[PDB]
Amino acid sequence: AFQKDAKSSAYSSRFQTPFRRRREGKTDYYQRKRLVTQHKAKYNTPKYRLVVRFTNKDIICQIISSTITGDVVLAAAYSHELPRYGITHGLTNWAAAYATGLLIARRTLQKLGFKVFLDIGLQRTTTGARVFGALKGASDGGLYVPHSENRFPGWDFETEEIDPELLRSYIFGGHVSQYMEELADDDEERFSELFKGYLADDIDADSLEDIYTSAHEAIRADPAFKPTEKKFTKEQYAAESKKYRQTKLSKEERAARVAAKIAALAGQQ
Amino acid sequence: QNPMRDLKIEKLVLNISVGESGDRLTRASKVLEQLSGQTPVQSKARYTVRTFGIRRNEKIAVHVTVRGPKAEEILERGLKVKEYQLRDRNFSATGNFGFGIDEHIDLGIKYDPSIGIFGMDFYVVMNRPGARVTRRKRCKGTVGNSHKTTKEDTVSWFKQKYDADVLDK
Known part of the structure; x- marks a missing residue:
């Protein structure tokens, strides 16, 4: 980098590296401490977090607990399963968060015959955020997930009040259809760009609420998680992958490279 | 290479x-x-x-601070004032640039004697796509070397579109 920046021996020598999962900007250890650590007199009683995470367009809900060897997944549901239940579009929206969360609750609570805490991760807590969508679905789903109402959309700021006519509307995609409506007579340039697939499968707005309404039914009816079929084995995926992973060296090879180098770069061209 | 490592303006920051x-x-x-x-x-x-x-x-x-389109207008608009001639300094080693103008009227804007005249500081910070990596909350990173905005690279950018002149040694 910059000549008069650059790093001394002494800088590096005494540098204390942060964790790794911190270097990665992925773990808030301060919040993790407080999420995980258990009352000392409840002994080996695991403290299960419901982890909700948003990728660029897949939602992740795992129920996780901890172990000094590593954390431990009890249950996992991904919003990409939702085609299974009759959901194909907008699956990182507030309603896919709800749906996925309900899928998580129903699924685990099944394989159990349950108290659990929200790991928001690094998400901001803004009112109307969709992490909290996950929460509602896991809670309407059957889990005991301790929570308050003031981050669900349709929470009145300037009064301690929830409009649930609104929050229902979000669970079902009502803000998405209403946009989808509104775009059907003020601009079809854009309505064909985004909302494309809805044309391509003939699902115009009004129906949006039913898709989710019956995604719900479908889910409670069979939450039991279908793994993908696979196609190619452990071994193959491995083998084709090693075609693309460089492999280190011997000191012997490196030794030559320098000796070779002092043959070239040195003895007067 | 170049695709997607264009050279948008991150932001213009006028200062009085x-x-x-x-x-x-x-x-x-x-x-x-x-x-x-x-x-x-x-x-x-x-x-x-x-x-x-x-x-x-x-x-x-x-x-x-002013970002996107609106940025480019006021840039060019005051860039005019400066007769499209900056200087070889004016540009930072990290590839941003600025100039001053006095008399804030030399770029649209009437007079109004109950307002007065003011000088302004114009400062234009440049970047490429994927600036977000160094700026979002999670997985905050630093941008790769062969992606960083530089003086050479930004001057050449300026000299081009705008057509304006650089000046000095």
Whole structure:
């Protein structure tokens, strides 16, 4: 980098590296401490977090607990399963968060015959955020997930009040259809760009609420998680992958490279 | 290579130093408002000076940051004023640049004698796509070497579109 920046021996020598999962900007250890650590007199009683995470367009809900060897997944549901239940579009929206969360609750609570805490991760807590969508679905789903109402959309700021006519509307995609409506007579340039697939499968707005309404039914009816079929084995995926992973060296090879180098770069061209 | 490592402007930040609070500052503010449409921000003196006649926390200067299209207008519009001639300094080693103009009228904007005239500081910070990596909350990273904005690269950018001249050695 910059000549008069650059790093001394002494800088590096005494540098204390942060964790790794911190270097990665992925773990808030301060919040993790407080999420995980258990009352000392409840002994080996695991403290299960419901982890909700948003990728660029897949939602992740795992129920996780901890172990000094590593954390431990009890249950996992991904919003990409939702085609299974009759959901194909907008699956990182507030309603896919709800749906996925309900899928998580129903699924685990099944394989159990349950108290659990929200790991928001690094998400901001803004009112109307969709992490909290996950929460509602896991809670309407059957889990005991301790929570308050003031981050669900349709929470009145300037009064301690929830409009649930609104929050229902979000669970079902009502803000998405209403946009989808509104775009059907003020601009079809854009309505064909985004909302494309809805044309391509003939699902115009009004129906949006039913898709989710019956995604719900479908889910409670069979939450039991279908793994993908696979196609190619452990071994193959491995083998084709090693075609693309460089492999280190011997000191012997490196030794030559320098000796070779002092043959070239040195003895007067 | 080049695809997707274009060279957008991150932001333009106009700045008005005024060795005092009061009318003369709220007027500098008024200028930046009507010129940006955004309501501008005030800055307090960091320590007290005396030979500059200011006290810690005095409110001494306003400024405003402006992004996308609107940025380019005011850039070019005041870039005009400067006859499309900057200098070889003016550009930072990290590839941003700026200039001053006095008389904030030399770029649209009437006179109004109950407003006065002000000088402005123009400062243009440049970047490429994927600036977000160094700026979002999670997995905050630093941008790869062969992606960083530089002086060479930004000058050449300026010399091109705009057509303007660089100047000096």
